[PDB]
Design a protein around this ligand. Structure first.
Ligand SMILES: C[S@@+](CC[C@H](N)C(=O)[O-])C[C@H]1O[C@@H](n2cnc3c(N)ncnc32)[C@H](O)[C@@H]1O
Ligand SMILES: C[S@@+](CC[C@H](N)C(=O)[O-])C[C@H]1O[C@@H](n2cnc3c(N)ncnc32)[C@H](O)[C@@H]1O
Ligand SMILES: Nc1ncnc2c1ncn2[C@@H]1O[C@H](COP(=O)(O)O)[C@@H](O)[C@H]1O
Ligand SMILES: Nc1ncnc2c1ncn2[C@@H]1O[C@H](COP(=O)(O)O)[C@@H](O)[C@H]1O
Ligand SMILES: Nc1ncnc2c1ncn2[C@@H]1O[C@H](COP(=O)(O)O)[C@@H](O)[C@H]1O
Ligand SMILES: [Cl-]
Ligand SMILES: [Cl-]
Ligand SMILES: [Cl-]
Lengths: 442, 442, 268
């Protein structure tokens, strides 16, 4: 009888599915976690076009497992306590059409035995802290990596060191240390455990998909360090830029988080409303919240200029500078400038034409834009002290201009006629050269 | 953005000042502690005649600090977590007229760096147990002493060993062990932490002031052992007697607490309604509650008789006994007696006149007052077996009286005529001498 | 042994004694958390400070500030050169303030002395806040009045053959009416091409007080830069500063270098 099986539970941790007579006894009601988990189930089931195979690690009394089988999922629940699995099976038998199996076993051994494709979604709620406590953080990171490797999505509720109990002392400094080796992760909620006032965060993690409520797609590779608060995911015709505003440990000062926030926000604003006369990459999706923000854009051909420079690849500096200057002059005509023209913000296509790819540093108002013209000289010099004729003649001409006349329209016009300009080395000069060489050091 | 800073808090311990959208998330609402702390702020600000400088140690999200700056305080809040201070500063910036500064730092180092007069009030709520746990009880006592030394008042909420967590084991037996080296302390409330059913006591502590809601004054010295449940504070024209009914450890049996309670209560009753014919010290303030009671009296000139006896000072036993007997006879005429006439209850002024200074042992009804007359002989003998003529003749005369006639009016009358009384050594006597000598041993 | 006492506010070595246990003597220190205790000056103080804006301590009493410099410090803390510079600055400050130049309001000197370990100077206390604090705590400042008043005092010093080698925000105090004055005279000098370097730093000062110069500050600097170098001095700097609204617009000229050299200087 169910009555007996429930009584023999060491703890009624969860609601007993279909049996509200124990709801008052359950440590956690599970309705809040279930609301969120069913939303994510539906998103992923919609994306894949079918009901999911779900793995429930430390499934306890089966509530999540049965609740998803109720919606058509095929589920396997694992728990190392016989008493818990006895209840899960007795509940499944009351619901014979649910495709639900339960097994006694250890999460560590199950994860080692998993095969990729067997399960689409795994859930691990409030269980990994027990594995941390007995086996340490590094083994848990590897288990969670494998779990992500073999599924399409993982949902974790993770206990945290701020919880007031003795086992909190063995927890990592931040729960994100258990998952940050995985490719994609997002905080999706925080839940009251009824053990204390400290809530547990729930994360959605994937090694195969971008999972954003509006955009759910496989990616084939990703990157953290460009050229660690920013991650880039590459799919067939998209790049998803994912910025963390909220990072663990020291990592971001207040100012840096706000700048992550500012840049991504500014980039979204510009790209959703670009200026006429400028070909901006197209925007497929975007959003922001307290922890992070994201932007999914069309994927552009080419390589990042700084990589080409680092990997000593052959470059046409004329075509790169010409094309970039042309786009900068067109921006300026529409009252836009870019505050940070550097090799890692420039992409060069197969025909050696260049374009900006980060619009975080775009600005709309201001003497000016004289400073930006100055840095652009450094850019030029780093792209190559190092300027042969007629690049040097170009710069010398700019330097002879009154400063109120410095702007990107002028820079471009002089650049186009640089072969006609007088020879800098024939003049006393000589300072423009030394100031940028010191700048280009500085 | 505030949203991001709040999300990055390891814990939302407190209400976020001005932002009730996180009140449901806060571990503690802080309104109960704040009600009490603002009352004490006002009392001390009233006494000093000005807005206060306040130090908030382990200030977390700044709630107490901002709430007091709102009332005109100048505040500095200290916390060792960067995330907490980032939120405090962002909140202060929403309230630019608040004089509020926040710094990342360790309480131990801040206390060492404090200067006397820099802050009037320091608050340390639920933070010292963390310092106990890492550095031990003795270092925390010294830190708290210095904090009291450099401020006018300190408010502490202290965690206690009855809390059910592993760190409770490192706590002192009683939270008062962290503060009882400070001069003045009083329990002002007890608060629910939401971690468990065990509340934390809040103490008001000072090394410079008596801080009683009705009486708020500097003192220039204090004393525990007269001539440890009783403390005396001396200010310019007052003495404040402070009795603990509730003491830590074994210290007071039930009967002793009740006797502390009884004596102070009895003293208040007598002094607020003294008998005509008796100059009683005047009463400036008084009150009692579950933990303790206090009485502020006019300060009397002179020295305590027992000190004079111990420090072998010159005394006039005639004038001391005469003056004391005169006051005892006047009490008796009004139906009052003192149950405990001893050197430590008697004060002697510069002209060698004596008076009682503790009225805890005053009584109003009863064969009697024969026992008291007997002890008074011991008193006499200890003030000096040891009686020369005519003191011995005085006592001998009293002993020849039928016992129903023994009382302080008789004692006084015979004392005044003692030079005329017959010589005891000429009589068989001899017993009155031996009984008191054995009594005076006993 | 100073590690046992350096957390206390005021301390001074007053002697060293033979113990008769060995040839190593024991130092005797006089320590206080409430008073400056110098044989000539014995007064309560109500607050003190080590790091300005750890070999220098400042004590504040009712109408005084006592500057206390350690020449002899524990541990690594001061190299030989640094102790000598502590010694030099305090000595130089005492000399200047006890004999100030006419045309310059110098803070008054109440007491002073030096010995092997340290030196001290007790001065009148000036109203106002240190400029660098105001800058750090983003307080409202009038850069015109600050620069005007400072330049006026620098020009008057120069007329008497005095210059200040280290005009920086932490050496300047600004009163309630936004007038500024120097408060550290350790870096005062009396002889020398010159004072051209000092005029150059003063541009950095200016720029840090705000790359960052709007008109007519930029026009001021541009005018100075067009001057032959033998003409650079604080009298000139002040005169051009007072007429800066009339000077030609720098942005209308090729310039442009004075701007870039100070911006690199102001980084450097
Ligand atoms: C705190 S409960 C959480 C239950 C459930 N996941 C939930 O959040 O509603 C932890 C569960 O994991 C199980 N468990 C703990 N460690 C395990 C392991 N190494 N392998 C399998 N099950 C485990 C326990 O038996 C218990 O049922
Ligand atoms: C439990 S909370 C109490 C917060 C706040 N005082 C209150 O009662 O509302 C303890 C706070 O003290 C801080 N803290 C703990 N030890 C500290 C130390 N040694 N120095 C500075 N801050 C400390 C923690 O960062 C935390 O914000
Ligand atoms: N729209 C895009 N199309 C292709 N690559 C991109 C796009 N946006 C960013 N990247 C790439 O992102 C990588 C590192 O991030 P980022 O700092 O954006 O360059 C580089 O290899 C860029 O080429
Ligand atoms: N009203 C008072 N005036 C002066 N001293 C007092 C007064 N009441 C108590 N004391 C002093 O309190 C000290 C110790 O406490 P007690 O047991 O009250 O004597 C003695 O030194 C007494 O002289
Ligand atoms: N004569 C003075 N009057 C007032 N403050 C002074 C005086 N001399 C130095 N200070 C203060 O000393 C502090 C730090 O030392 P200093 O490096 O001298 O500025 C600053 O807050 C100054 O304002
Ligand atoms: Cl491992
Ligand atoms: Cl967990
Ligand atoms: Cl505590």
């Amino acid at each position: 009888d169910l009555n007996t099986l429930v009584s023999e539970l060491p703890e009624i941790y969860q609601t007993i599915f279909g049996h509200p007579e124990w709801d008052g006894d359950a440590a956690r009601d599970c309705n809040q976690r279930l609301d969120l988990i069913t939303e994510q189930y539906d998103n992923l089931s919609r994306a894949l076009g079918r009901p999911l195979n779900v793995l429930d690690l430390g499934c306890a009394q089966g509530f999540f497992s049965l609740s998803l089988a109720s919606k058509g999922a095929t589920i396997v629940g694992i728990d190392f306590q016989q008493e818990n699995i006895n209840v899960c099976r007795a509940l499944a038998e009351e619901n014979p059409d649910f495709a639900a199996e339960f097994r006694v076993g250890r999460i560590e051994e199950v994860i080692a035995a998993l095969e990729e494709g067997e399960f689409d979604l795994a859930i691990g709620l409030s269980v990994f802290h027990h594995i941390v406590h007995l086996h340490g953080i590094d083994e848990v990171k590897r288990l969670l990596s494998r779990l992500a490797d073999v599924t399409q999505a993982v949902i974790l509720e993770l206990a945290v060191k701020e919880e007031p109990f003795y086992w909190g002392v063995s927890q990592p400094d931040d729960p994100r240390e258990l998952i940050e080796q995985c490719a994609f992760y997002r905080l999706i909620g925080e839940f009251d455990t009824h053990l204390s006032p400290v809530p547990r965060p729930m994360y959605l993690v994937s090694n195969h998909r971008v999972l954003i409520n509006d955009f759910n797609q496989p990616f084939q590779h990703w990157q953290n360090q460009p050229y660690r608060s920013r991650r880039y995911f590459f799919g067939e015709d998209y790049v998803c830029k994912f910025f963390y505003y909220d990072m663990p440990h020291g990592i971001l000062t207040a100012e840096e988080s706000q700048r992550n926030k500012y840049e991504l926000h500014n980039e979204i604003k510009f790209l959703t409303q670009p200026p006429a006369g400028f070909d901006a990459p197209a925007v497929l999706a975007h959003g922001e919240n307290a922890q992070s923000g994201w932007l999914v854009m069309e994927k552009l051909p080419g390589r990042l200029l700084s990589d080409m420079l680092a990997a000593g690849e052959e470059i046409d500096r004329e075509k790169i500078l010409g094309s970039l200057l042309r786009s900068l002059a067109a921006l300026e005509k529409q009252g836009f400038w870019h505050d940070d023209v550097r090799p890692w913000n420039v992409m060069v296509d197969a025909r050696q034409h260049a374009r900006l790819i980060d619009f975080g540093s775009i600005v709309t108002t201001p003497s000016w834009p004289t400073n930006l013209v100055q840095s652009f000289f450094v850019f030029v010099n780093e792209l190559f002290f190092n300027l042969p004729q007629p690049w040097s003649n170009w710069l010398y001409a700019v330097w002879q201009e009154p400063v109120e006349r410095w702007n990107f329209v002028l820079l471009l016009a002089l650049f186009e006629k640089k072969a006609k300009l007088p020879s800098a080395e024939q003049q006393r000069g000589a300072t423009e050269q030394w100031i940028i060489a010191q700048e280009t050091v500085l």
